[PDB]
């Protein structure tokens, strides 16, 4: 069902200790801590490295040779085991980086999966439950349920037969020599993973595939499992968390109300365990961290999308902002243009702190900014800040080349909730918390009747657990049917990102492009161009918002007829993006409908600059004329621009024509077509 | 575009006061008490009736004409203070109506005489504000109700004409405002008998909100079978539902069916009954439990659960009185004793002040007959009235079901082990949270900023310990991925439920399930158990266990093809569909499937019935006979029932089999000989 290096894989059997969990390094630490406690001297690193693979008796005899015959090894070993369970039970089993990502890929590939551990059923199940990876496995095969353990192939042969499979149909993952022998002899496809000790030549010769760590196998596996499709609206996020952290530099409208969704979807197999987001807004920070989650409201479908595993931090706080740029695998800069200059310093400090970090992988930096050459601006200011910070041109140049700086095109319009509306929301929901908290004490008491199954010692201990659990959880039962709404966003899913970063390859809500130019040109003419032309019409007709204006059937007709004339033109210029034009065309008309929040002021800024020969208006006219297409609405849009310039911005009527004639001359048209365009456009302006 | 009784609908503009919420009755009582604390003399009831669906401005004009700011301010303060304690009284049906209209693709709004500050406070509180694109209040209107401006401005902001929009209203004044707008007016009675003038103005009339819902529902697409990991609805209706028996199938299947519901709304509360206290206290502590689908390693969280005691009477009466749908999920042994608890509940429902949809989940040929027999005997004993019983029995919808899904309940040992592990994480979490002021003016007053700090600090204190539940789940059930339940036609409610498929000849399917499905399932489980396997999934990996099950399937199908020639075509699909579910049932234990061997070895049950059929028609029953022998072998060895009792049962059941004396003695001789052979 799953093809791996030309071999059909129907099953996957994992060793537990050293392969799935990092319990061999923990057993390394506990032995040292137990030694320092009892005998006073800590067992050498060198001794413990020598003991890897040896029996408990050989290890004891070796300890006797080095630390004397009367060395209390058996009670050192027993004390080390106490320390192991004590650590594992509270702090959790240490899971190898990339395991959960690997398990989700094998499971969604329809593999039957087992564990073949030398440990006992009892302790094995607890570890797998503790780690929350028990769910991934159909059967567990244990050392206390086989006549001959590893390196005899029984445990792997048995694990395979229980899954209804031949050994040769299964991948077999293992760290130890005896284990790899057991898996190999059974006749399975052996995956050897280095844990602590470098594997000897006999092991590397024996193994079918070798990797230095789990993540190196994950990278190999990724070639044989598909990138998932574009997520639909109301589609769930993955349940399983990977060990990666991601960042959103600027927890604003687009940061919290769009980028959060993309990072929450991730690759569809797993999602990050933590999303760090920076804001100066104290109310927003403390509110999200209180709930431990916020929600994005999609008005069109009346759907509240819960974003979990969020951790909001202060932008002014260094320790927190450095922790973002140190631990994050991917970061999304979601700032306005004016903020880029000031925030270039706190980025530089972040990337320099990452460079100085003695722990690792190149950062993927998404530039979320609706502007042409948006990446150039950030990289220019970032370079200046890095020089000013370090005064080391070689280090500054290294940092600028190490990481993946990605230019993006975003289409989703998002609205951030006001602090007045947030306070009003917190008041009404704190009210429900009090309403909820007065009838939790109405229940009261814990009662566990005689099970006639559980012993009275553990029956008593069960009462203490559930009582302690209920007391802490019951107050937060209201969160089931209660959300913290901070964002009102449209339904547009796909983000376009510059191809380069390996980490983007599997991100399902991302559309990779070799160069951003093409989709950035569509964004300019089809979206920003119509938005500006539609805003100039609304402003002159005297409507407060572009959303209100759509009530007037003249405005809505103009909008629908305008996106049609532009789309026609772009289809000829970019036939490869035909599907992207149709999707973006409707997406704009949907968002424009109830666009009450966003004003026309900021959209109608610099009309003369937007009426340039190679810009979002005139370029579309010239394209439509060259390929003989209707441009009557684009002409009306251009006129409304010069009309808006004269009336609102107090531009001279002579200065408008002075500009116009220079733009028409620069268009790739016949001298006949140029003079015809001027004559028509000037008459539309004098009417308005 | 929605087609409501022929007319095309593009939008829907509701009234708030007395249409969406029952706030007209509240402000009625506040204005009276407001005119007692201040001026002393209460307002006339005639004045208040003429103030229905009037703007605070227009109501003040009526007051001066007969005889207010101070009066209404105190009245509004009292009104919203009542809302802070009890909540907004949502008219039953509203949430269900709104979701159907929203998903139909209609452009919806609110047109209320109330001002903005109040209008939003309720719409947020009720949590219906998300369903509306725009709202029109009594502020931004120049001339309030009964002038049509407020309903014209509402339709204008939706970018539609009034005649394209539905208009919901309670007041006589507001209906005139809605009618003069030239829209499709709908009238909902609240606290005034509609006049001749009102009933003529209206295009449609309904007694209450829920009466419209039922009429609207026949123009709303019925959503089809849900997929595995498809989410449940977000919005909650006011309906309660019951699971009589929080067991494997009750908690691990029926809970999913009820949680999906119609796909528009979900029950407010699902009440499940269990004697198991650990299960009860565990779910109530977490507030949720999860169903583990091992095939796809997917955990399905079940929200809005209330686990009650089966013995506790008042809680079981709470279920049967307020529930719209009860699901009986008990085995045969429980039916007799629990029929007393059902009798009290149904009698309590009749005494109190909608019909009930009663699902019987029971693997028995003639399941409903047994349930209805014990229920009538139980009812008659308590009521001592034949007139009230024959009404109750033929008032509610008692539905036979076929359930194909295999589900496993978690052991108390494994649940304790789960709680022990997850408690250690909670303890370590509570240390991390130990070691808040909202600083700077965020366009808020110093009073609000200090009030916000108290709200957030208190919210953090209560919620922060429960943050761990984002990742942490309570796993109580292991279930395969079979979605559709098959129910007999009758109950109109089951038409609209997504996960329910309606059928006619339920008896014919129930018989085939008993013999071909549940019979082979039990017999291979006995063979697997005695061979050493503790899992159905692992056992089916054995060539002998699968060869046995395949041979049984063949012998049963050969007999069913004679008894039911009209179903003979379908047997291959069902027999294969069974083996598919068995093949990879790794978390389904043999012990669960091999329960009650003697009951399953009854003369008219999943083993002996097949043996009897094949003997009459001279069909081979060699493997079927071996499975019966393994059934008694399991009972004697694993359950320990005494060998003498196993023979006394064997001899009695063979005596009941519709065979000749020659066949009876030969069957007894062949079977008892084969039992002693296994123990050799
Ligand atoms: N939202 C949209 O409709 C779309 C926007 N975009 C792009 O997304 C980017 C952000 O949009 P949006 O999120 O709406 O911007 P916001 O106005 O919501 O603020 C965004 C973030 O920038 C921070 N910020 C703003 N000004 C400053 C400043 N002067 N100094 C320091 N930090 C500052 C804010 O901090 P605090 O949180 O403390 O305010 C916030 O976290 C813009 O570049 C825009 O072009 C792209 C397409 C669509
Ligand atoms: N699960 C499955 O795979 C399928 C089950 N079914 C049918 O559903 C019915 C039971 O399903 P299942 O849930 O598996 O049974 P379970 O034993 O798993 O659950 C039993 C439920 O009934 C209650 N109960 C059991 N015995 C008694 C009794 N003697 N007196 C009172 N209450 C009792 C239990 O209460 P407590 O919680 O206190 O034990 C529990 O709520 C049977 O008819 C079965 O054939 C249908 C198809 C397959
Ligand atoms: Cl990982
Ligand atoms: Cl309802
Ligand atoms: Mg190992
Ligand atoms: Mg009214």
**What is the C-alpha to C-alpha distance for residues A631 and A32, in angstroms, rounded to an integer?**
80
Please report the atom of ligand 2 found closest to the CA of residue B595. 17
For chain A, breaks with the C atom over 2.5 A from the next N come after 359
B397, β-bridge pairs: B357
CB neighbour burial string for B370-388, b if at least 16 within 10 angstroms, e if fewer: bbeebbbebbeeebeeeee
Distance from CA of A71 to the nearest CA of B (A): 34
**What is the C-alpha to C-alpha distance for residues A237 and A216, in angstroms, rounded to an integer?**
25
**What is the C-alpha to C-alpha distance for residues B107 and B119, in angstroms, rounded to an integer?**
19
Listed in sequence order, the residues at least 6 apart from A507 whose beta carbon sits closer than 8 Å to its beta carbon are: A262, A265, A266, A267
Distances (CA, A) of B506 to A20, A98, B62, B399, B400: 49, 50, 65, 10, 7
CA of B218 to the centre of ligand 6 (A): 27
Q: Per-residue DSSP letters for A116-128?
A: E-SS-HHHHHHHH
Listed in sequence order, the residues at least 6 apart from B92 whose beta carbon sits closer than 8 Å to its beta carbon are: B208, B209, B210, B238
Q: Per-residue DSSP letters for A247-287?
A: EEES-SHHIIIIIHHHHHHTTSS-B-SEEEEEES-HHHHHH
Which of A263, A284, A492, A538 lies closest to A370, judged by CA?
A492
Q: Residues B57, B173: contact at Cβ < 8 Å?
A: no
Distance from CA of A160 to the nearest CA of B (A): 10
Which of A437, A460, A244 lies closest to B466, judged by CA?
A437
User: Tokens standing for A291?
Assistant: 């709930």
3-state secondary structure (DSSP) of residue A659: helix
Which chain B residue is nearest to residue A434, measuring alpha carbons? B85
**What is the C-alpha to C-alpha distance for residues A332 and B611, in angstroms, rounded to an integer?**
70
Question: Residue with structure tokens 């006394």?
Answer: B648
Which of B278, B339, B335, B283 lies closest to B306, judged by CA?
B283
**What is the C-alpha to C-alpha distance for residues B527 and B542, in angstroms, rounded to an integer?**
11
**Which residues have a beta carbon within 5 Å of ligand 3, which is an ion?**
A 97-98, 101, 242-243
Q: Per-residue DSSP letters for B148-186?
A: THHHHHHHHHTTS-GGGEEEEE-SHHHHHHHHHTTSEEE
3-state secondary structure (DSSP) of residue A141: strand
**What is the C-alpha to C-alpha distance for residues B413 and B416, in angstroms, rounded to an integer?**
5
Total residue count of chain A as it appears in this document = 688
Q: How far out from the chain centre does Cα B586 lie?
A: 28
Resolution (A): 2.8
Which of A548, A538, A523 lies closest to A637, judged by CA?
A538
3-state secondary structure (DSSP) of residue B59: helix
Q: Per-residue DSSP letters for B449-484?
A: HHHHHHHHHHHHHHHGGGGGGGT---EEEEE-S---
Q: Please give the torsion angle defined by the CA atoms of residues B527, B530, B533 and B538, in that order, rounded to the nearest 10 degrees.
A: -10
Integer-rounded Cα radius of gyration of chain A: 32
3-state secondary structure (DSSP) of residue B38: coil
Q: Give chain A's largest Cα–Cα span.
A: 107
Report the interhelical angle of B412-432 vs A73-91 (nearest 10°): 80
3-state secondary structure A173-241: EECCHHHHHHHHHHCCEEEEECCCCCCCHHHHHHCCEEECCHHHHHHHHCCCCCCCCCCCCCCCCCCCE
Distances (CA, A) of A203 to A125, A176, A198, A212, B122: 29, 9, 10, 13, 71
**What is the C-alpha to C-alpha distance for residues B252 and B257, in angstroms, rounded to an integer?**
10
- CB nearest to B299's CB, from A130, A135, A281: A135
Q: Residues B471, A241: contact at Cβ < 8 Å?
A: yes
Alpha helices, DSSP H, located in A413-552: 419-437, 456-473, 517-522, 529-541, 546-549
Q: Residues B30, B78: contact at Cβ < 8 Å?
A: yes
Interface touch B303/A92, C-beta < 8 Å: no
**What is the C-alpha to C-alpha distance for residues A240 and B298, in angstroms, rounded to an integer?**
9
A421 is in an annotated binding site: no
User: Tokens standing for B179?
Assistant: 């009618």
Helix, strand, coil percent values for chain A (each to nearest 5): 55, 15, 30
CA of B169 to the centre of ligand 3 (A): 56
B285 HSE (CA, 13 A, CB side): 28
Please report the atom of ligand 1 found closest to the CA of residue A343. 31
Give the Cβ contact number of residue A48 at 10 Å: 18
Q: Residues A237, A271: contact at Cβ < 8 Å?
A: yes
Q: Residues A252, A416: contact at Cβ < 8 Å?
A: yes
B269, β-bridge pairs: B240
CA of A196 to the centre of ligand 5 (A): 11
Interface touch A447/B413, C-beta < 8 Å: no
Give the Cβ contact number of residue A204 at 10 Å: 13
Q: Residues A49, A59: contact at Cβ < 8 Å?
A: no
Q: Which ligand is nearest to the CA of A181?
A: 5
Which run of H or E residues covers position B108?
A: strand B107-111
Q: Cβ-count burial of B410 within 10 angstroms (0-12 exposed, 13-18 middle, 19+ buried)? A: buried
3-state secondary structure (DSSP) of residue A602: coil
- CB nearest to B102's CB, from A135, A302, A435: A302
Which run of H or E residues covers position B292?
A: strand B289-293
Distance from CA of B24 to the nearest CA of A (A): 21
A415 Cβ inside 6 Å of ligand 1 = no
Which of A170, A146, A130 lies closest to A14, judged by CA?
A170
């Amino acid at each position: 069902v799953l093809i791996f290096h030309g071999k059909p894989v129907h099953g996957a059997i994992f060793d537990m200790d050293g392969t799935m969990f990092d319990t061999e390094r923990l057993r390394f630490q506990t032995l040292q801590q137990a030694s320092q406690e009892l005998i006073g001297q800590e067992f050498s690193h060198e001794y413990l490295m020598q003991c890897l693979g040896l029996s408990a008796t050989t290890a004891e005899k070796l300890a006797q040779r080095l630390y004397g015959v009367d060395v209390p090894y058996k009670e050192i070993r027993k004390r080390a085991d106490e320390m192991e369970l004590e650590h594992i039970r509270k702090h959790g089993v240490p899971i190898k980086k990339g395991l959960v990502q690997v398990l989700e890929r094998l499971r969604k590939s329809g593999l039957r999966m087992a564990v073949a551990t030398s440990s006992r059923r009892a302790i094995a199940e607890e570890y797998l439950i503790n780690a929350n990876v028990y769910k991934f496995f159909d059967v567990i095969t244990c050392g206390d349920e086989v006549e001959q353990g590893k390196p005899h192939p029984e445990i792997f042969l048995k694990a395979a037969s229980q899954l209804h499979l031949d050994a040769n149909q299964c991948l077999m993952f293992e760290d130890s020599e005896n284990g790899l022998t057991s898996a190999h002899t059974s006749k399975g496809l052996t995956i050897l993973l280095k844990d602590i000790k470098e594997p000897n030549d006999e092991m590397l010769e024996k193994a079918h595939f070798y990797y230095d760590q789990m993540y190196d196998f994950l990278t190999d596996l990724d070639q044989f499992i598909p990138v998932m499709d574009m997520p639909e609206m109301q589609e769930p996020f993955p349940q399983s968390l990977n060990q990666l952290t991601v960042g959103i530099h600027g927890f604003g409208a687009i940061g919290g109300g769009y980028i959060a969704q993309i990072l929450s979807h991730w690759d569809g197999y797993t999602k990050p365990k933590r999303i760090i987001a920076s804001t100066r807004n104290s109310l927003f920070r403390e509110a999200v961290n209180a709930f431990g989650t916020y929600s994005i409201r999609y008005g069109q479908f009346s759907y509240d999308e819960r974003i979990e595993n969020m951790s909001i931090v202060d932008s002014d706080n260094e320790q927190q902002m450095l922790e973002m740029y140190t631990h994050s695998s991917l970061i999304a800069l979601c700032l306005p243009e004016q903020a880029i200059e000031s925030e270039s310093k706190i980025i530089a400090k972040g990337l320099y702190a990452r460079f100085n970090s003695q722990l690792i992988e190149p950062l993927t930096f998404l530039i979320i900014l609706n502007k042409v050459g948006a990446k150039y601006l950030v990289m220019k200011h970032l370079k200046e800040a890095l020089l000013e910070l370090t005064n080391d041109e070689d280090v500054t140049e290294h940092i600028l080349k190490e990481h993946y700086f990605c230019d993006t095109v975003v289409n989703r319009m998002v609205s951030k909730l006001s602090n007045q509306n947030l306070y009003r929301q917190l008041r009404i929901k704190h009210n429900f918390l009090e309403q909820h908290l007065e009838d939790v004490e109405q229940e009261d008491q814990i009662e566990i009747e005689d099970c006639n199954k559980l012993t009275p010692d553990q029956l008593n201990q069960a009462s203490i657990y559930v009582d302690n659990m209920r007391r802490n959880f019951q107050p937060g039962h209201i969160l089931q049917s209660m959300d913290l709404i901070l964002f009102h966003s449209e339904t547009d899913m796909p983000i376009y990102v510059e191809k380069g970063s390996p980490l983007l390859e599997k991100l399902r809500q991302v559309v990779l492009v070799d160069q951003i130019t093409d989709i950035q040109l569509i964004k300019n003419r089809l979206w920003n161009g119509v938005h500006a032309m539609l805003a100039w019409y609304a402003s002159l007709m005297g409507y407060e918002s572009i959303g209100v204006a759509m009530g007037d059937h003249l405005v809505k007709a103009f909008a629908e007829n305008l996106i049609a004339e532009v789309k026609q033109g772009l289809a000829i210029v970019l036939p490869n993006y035909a599907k992207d034009l149709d999707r973006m065309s409707q997406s704009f008309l949907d968002s424009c409908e109830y666009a009450f929040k966003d004003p026309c002021q900021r959209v109608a800024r610099d009309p003369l600059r937007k009426l340039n020969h190679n810009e979002r208006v005139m370029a579309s006219i010239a394209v439509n004329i060259r390929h003989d297409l209707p441009y009557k609405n684009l002409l009306k849009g251009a006129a409304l621009g010069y009309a808006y310039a004269i009336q609102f911005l107090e531009i001279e009527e002579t200065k408008a024509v002075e500009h116009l004639q220079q733009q028409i001359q620069n268009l790739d048209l016949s001298t006949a077509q140029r003079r015809q365009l001027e004559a028509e456009l000037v008459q539309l302006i004098q009417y308005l």
